[PDB]
Amino acid sequence: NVIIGNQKLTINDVARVARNGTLVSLTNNTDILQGIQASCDYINNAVESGEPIFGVTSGFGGMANVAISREQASELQTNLVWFLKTGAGNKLPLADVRAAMLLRANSHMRGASGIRLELIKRMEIFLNAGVTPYVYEFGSIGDLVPLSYITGSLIGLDPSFKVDFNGKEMDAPTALRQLNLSPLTLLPKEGLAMMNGTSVMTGIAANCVYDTQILTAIAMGVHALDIQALNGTNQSFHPFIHNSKPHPGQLWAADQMISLLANSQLVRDELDGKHDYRDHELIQDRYSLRCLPQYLGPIVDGISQIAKQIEIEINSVTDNPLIDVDNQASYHGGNFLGQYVGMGMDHLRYYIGLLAKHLDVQIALLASPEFSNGLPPSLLGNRERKVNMGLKGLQICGNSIMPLLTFYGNSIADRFPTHAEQFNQNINSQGYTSATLARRSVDIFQNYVAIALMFGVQAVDLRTYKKTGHYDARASLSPATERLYSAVRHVVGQKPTSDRPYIWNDNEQGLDEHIARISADIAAGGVIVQAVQDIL
Amino acid sequence: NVIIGNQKLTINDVARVARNGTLVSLTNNTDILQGIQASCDYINNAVESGEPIFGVTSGFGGMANVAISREQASELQTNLVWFLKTGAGNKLPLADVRAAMLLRANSHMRGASGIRLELIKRMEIFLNAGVTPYVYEFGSIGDLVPLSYITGSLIGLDPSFKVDFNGKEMDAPTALRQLNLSPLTLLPKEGLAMMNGTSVMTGIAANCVYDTQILTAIAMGVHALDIQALNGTNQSFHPFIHNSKPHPGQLWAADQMISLLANSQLVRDELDGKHDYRDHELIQDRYSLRCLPQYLGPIVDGISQIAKQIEIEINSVTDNPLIDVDNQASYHGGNFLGQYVGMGMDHLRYYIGLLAKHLDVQIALLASPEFSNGLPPSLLGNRERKVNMGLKGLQICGNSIMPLLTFYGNSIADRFPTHAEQFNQNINSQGYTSATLARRSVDIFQNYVAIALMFGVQAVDLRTYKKTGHYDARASLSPATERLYSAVRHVVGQKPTSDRPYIWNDNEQGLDEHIARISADIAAGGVIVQAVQDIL
Amino acid sequence: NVIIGNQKLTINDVARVARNGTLVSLTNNTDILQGIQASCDYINNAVESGEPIFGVTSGFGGMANVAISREQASELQTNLVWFLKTGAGNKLPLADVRAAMLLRANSHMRGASGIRLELIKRMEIFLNAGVTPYVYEFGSIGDLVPLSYITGSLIGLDPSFKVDFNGKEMDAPTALRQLNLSPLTLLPKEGLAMMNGTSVMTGIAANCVYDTQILTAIAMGVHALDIQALNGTNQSFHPFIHNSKPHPGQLWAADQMISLLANSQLVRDELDGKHDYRDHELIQDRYSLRCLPQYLGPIVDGISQIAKQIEIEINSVTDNPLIDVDNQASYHGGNFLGQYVGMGMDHLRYYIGLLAKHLDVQIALLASPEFSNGLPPSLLGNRERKVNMGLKGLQICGNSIMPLLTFYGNSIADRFPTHAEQFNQNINSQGYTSATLARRSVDIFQNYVAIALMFGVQAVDLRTYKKTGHYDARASLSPATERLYSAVRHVVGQKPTSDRPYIWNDNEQGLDEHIARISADIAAGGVIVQAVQDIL
Ligand SMILES: O=C(O)CCc1ccccc1
Ligand SMILES: O=C(O)CCc1ccccc1
Ligand SMILES: O=C(O)CCc1ccccc1
């Protein structure tokens, strides 16, 4: 159970609540609760005293010059939900909305937001009950409009607000009746407390980072399989090389490779600096093998940097104005700008493209007899069935997906419109669509990694057959990559045996079904993910 | 003075040597000098014993399958200079080439490259004598070809090598004569020791990072001028706001802006928390002022991350193979792949475009009476000459430059050709052209920042006039921005005066001349750079 | 000789005047010359009568709300030169500036601009005398600022204007003195007549289109060399194939390749339709040969479309307001927006990157023995000197240039700033920087094509040798590609000979010198350009 108010949330915390339905509860720490209440009292007294506060006793953004009376102060926040009910396009994944709610709640616990504890708690109840508001993919320039949908569902403002109640679509007032809750009415500032901020884009981004850390670990395993299938050397990953060029990510990737290849019987074992003289001539490994740590270093380091930045944002107070009860003051600031998210997700998409292109080049070596060091063309299985073309179709599909991934590696934060919202929002982060685009990259990268996994699994079977009599690669692989191999072969439903490789005749499988099954297992955190669990 | 190989080099160190002609010397540490010699010993014995070593007793890259005898091993390295080099197209700044020679020599001191000390010393001599080999902008997929022009010049291989000898173009053999040096012939491995590696792209990147750090400080100062001109508040930068979203770069940007604005007579001083008129009523600032530290944060942190990555690359051993004397072995590795440089410069150009775009929307506020809070249209000075249009042309020029900077913020590392060099280099970093594009970005950004300074300086004069009798902003400005303001007007040669603003009639200056003077001063590290020295 | 305004100007016409110094003269057509005078008459009466006309009796752009009297109307135009111009940063090729003055003068002959004939004649005098005003590369969001440097120079406004007087830098007033001309002062509207419009960006674009058409022809010739070197078939270009997919550009590319390859002794001549060995068995060509006309088609048609669009822009009236003498009226319109240029150059740069990428994969086939069908590795000439590595360095340099060209194939028109010039210019074309980026693209492409020519020439020599006794490819080549081959080797100064290929030892040339010579020749319209003259 994740406790919200007392500690810092991690990306892993957010993914557990978001995807695994881990329960959540608000802290009962007495000072935190008091800070929450103090914040509301300050706002209550300011409104009554006719203190002028943008968005609380006056209008919003470019219409903040519009005066709002005390009698209309609550109605201002309520109406904020209505004129923001303007989303468009497809729905977010529920897991992203759950993440959004968890972050919104966390942000309120700091007590600078002036929102009722009963309203914070409503997010805890939705999360634990399995109620997820629908939220559209269009509407935020980086999260008013997405958040208004969460807000209107929480307070049950109107039947046009829809929720998913454990797989059941229904309207929000109906959901409140089932939970035995009452409709809520927003008090001054509460609308801004719910809707001003970065919770959705950061929630999306958090899940993207989690998914990409996992996909990177799996990618490392694929490369390890590729290297073993190509009969490449492990000399490339020797600590002496990387200690003298000590980028943290290069160091890490090289050292992870040593572990991944340790006790393999398929690599050239040359860590003593000397050629093994076991095949018919001396081979040098191409750059995609030799320069693998240098290439992945900045990606590994970048993802780690994004993860650090996204975790600050997770634990940030992001609405506005901010209430300082210690000095009885409020400040008109800008924490609702999700610039670390916009730029971070630009970087992430770019990194995913770089990962994919490197993997596709490995596949090009495996598939091509000129470069595969003895592997059959296109990793053909049954040689006596001449019509067999092996994994030729699977490569083309790989070739169709990677460039799309580099395409999404283009940036969007730099294309923000400077005329936005009556020229009030003349900079903005484009963080929201940047995050949804990242979700798209990650989803596509999951299919891509599935394909790469299939190539590596076939390939080590065929290499094993070259080295030994037979096709069961389990004995021959390094123990670390044996777990992944076996996990893939389990998920796909094709057991390793000494007499057949993973793929034998083109006739005997739909490769598409194997792609879908591996992808689904990666996304679910199945045995493939668990196989590479130790690569942090 | 800068001692090469007993201490890590910083980016400041590199810029001092490259730009300011700081003297350089090789360490006399007895241990270091033995490492350098032991490395040569190992190699020249390995070759004499007929060990197979790629690139040393064998051909290069895709032609590593070609065996090279004991007797041709030396000529192998000499010929590498001929086919490699002399593949080049257009021409790079001498300071970048000086940076490269410093980096190359620095990497050799580690004692793993198997290169003669007198070859290393020749880079020291060239640096202190001011002999700079000509290097072309095309030829490296990320430094064989660039480094070979340096190598051919150092050893005085042929008259077709041009150097710049403190201003004098010469052929290299002639430069050697005047320095009283003999030509050198490369021994086995020494060609690779000179031409394998990331020294030139990293040399370029290092100067770019240094310049971009300077421009970020100046940009901070420009924003501080803009805010004062616009009668903005300092409330947005209150630490209560930023402590509750504690990204390091955001915290830093807000704190710096507090310092930059302290004791200004031109800002609305609302750090109390409460409002009221010295203008309209209540005034709400637009996002480009209010969300400034949120926006600059990831740019600041990003430049800092690149800085840290480039300093590691600066102090790395990047040639190949690497000689490990303690275990008497060579390793065929890949430290010549400068992925941190190709990706880092992709990020740098992207950050610079975001800085420029933000500055440009401040210029839009300043120029437009709807948004300037009482400044004249286009920062017009003499309103009585009605044909005056003020800084309208200056704005258009700004508007033409900023989009070009976001254009250069496109990435190039992801567009690497997988068929490079006989399909041997099937991944590569594009780090060299990434770095020269960054240089182009930085150079354009110096022009842009010049314009933005001109806008800020004019504007505070006009705001001062609105407020007081006069046009001399020096007394009204925060002391921090007064330093910058005076420095700018010192450079353009237009003295502050209580009777006239910086720009009075359109008649009286070529603004093009002011831009050029301010840019030159920024490039030379002049008084404008010295005014913002405080900003780390 | 080129007569300005009684005939449409073509892109050939523009290049002849800009590059070859062709003499120019204004039409003496009595009707045209009356139109020009009637236009001035209308305007100078309208002003004298106090008509409100934007930019004529009122301020400019966002300051059009400022009224300008009869008495200051002339000074209004003179001052436009001062605030506009003199907003500029870095410097453009004289030929582009000559193109601009031709275009500007050409637009005035239509008689709708209200500008004095002696002002128009001054562009004629400058062109024929070889006086070229200095113009900077920054300042236009797509030509006020560039055109104002031309204007100030033409009228001799101030010594701060520099011109190039056939090689001599001068101030403009001094150039006027030597030409025996008086300074001019602008009359109402004449400033706009000179500085409103798309003449400079279109002048640049025109030279780019001309150069790109040349390089496309040369590229066709390079492919024809590549195909012959690779022992490719001409079957792929059979009209039965292309008639059944009849895109004009594809039809054209296939037919041209048939001509380029006719009577070659180096291709497999399979236009019959049936196969067989003069090699392996049956040989299938890869897509870069087989799909060549399908690939080049849209590039060819695209360049042709741009050509047609630019010629309309060339012959357009682009200033404002436009005087319609027949109805005695002015129209406030928008012909100064050069969207066809900003978008056309976006497309051009994109096409050029696609041409380069295609050429680069041919170079990969040539360099690699797995794919070259029997050519030596890296097109090595003297195989007995084992330290020779042939064109390996040349390939790497090619590999560094091509990705930069696809990089410049990114677009800039979509990145226009909507806040430009007091929010008056809330759309703009970015046409000027689009065009200067195209110039940068074209210039880099000339270097790239040089490399590709060097590869093709070497390769056919080596293929000829495989086939016959000797290295002289002249007899074996199709007559069409023999012209190109000889032209290239004339330029680099290495005569075909039966005993030695173009490149024998790495020892014996600086390949950098060959690239530079071939590029210079391509730029100057030399023998290499004349060899491919036949390709329309
Ligand atoms: O704080 C601001 O400047 C904008 C707040 C806001 C709230 C709801 C809609 C638009 C803007
Ligand atoms: O593969 C390598 O490590 C060397 C590649 C290379 C290519 C051309 C010249 C020197 C080295
Ligand atoms: O809006 C227009 O048509 C003119 C814009 C303009 C701006 C600055 C100088 C001349 C014209």
Author numbering:
A (entry chain B), B (entry chain A), C (entry chain A): 25 to 166, 170 to 563
Per the authors:
Enzymes with phenylalanine ammonia lyase (PAL) activity are able to catalyse non-oxidative deamination to yield cinnamate (1a) and ammonia from the proteinogenic amino acid L-phenylalanine (L-Phe, 2a). PALs also find use in the area of green chemistry and sustainable pharmaceutical manufacture as industrial biocatalysts, due to the reversibility of the deamination reaction.
The gene encoding AvPAL was mutated, incorporating two surface substitutions (C503S and C565S, known to aid crystallisation) and replacement of the loop tyrosine with a catalytically inert but shape-complementary phenylalanine (Y78F). The triple variant was purified and co-crystallised with the natural deamination product. Superimposition of these two structures revealed excellent complementarity with a few small differences between the unoccupied and occupied active sites. In the case of the unoccupied enzyme, the amino acid at position 78 is tyrosine which points inward toward the active site, providing no contact with the outer loop, whereas the new structure features Y78F with a dihedral swing of ~140° causing the bulky side chain to protrude outwards. Other differences included H359 moving into the active site sphere in the cinnamate bound structure, along with smaller shifts in the positions of Q311 and R317 (SI). Presumably these represent movements which occur upon substrate binding, although they may be induced instead by the Y78F variation as exchange of polar and non-polar residues in the inner active site loop of related enzymes has been reported to influence conformational dynamics. The 19 amino acid active-site sequence motif, as inferred from the AvPAL-cinnamate structure, was used to distinguish potentially useful enzyme sequences from other family members.
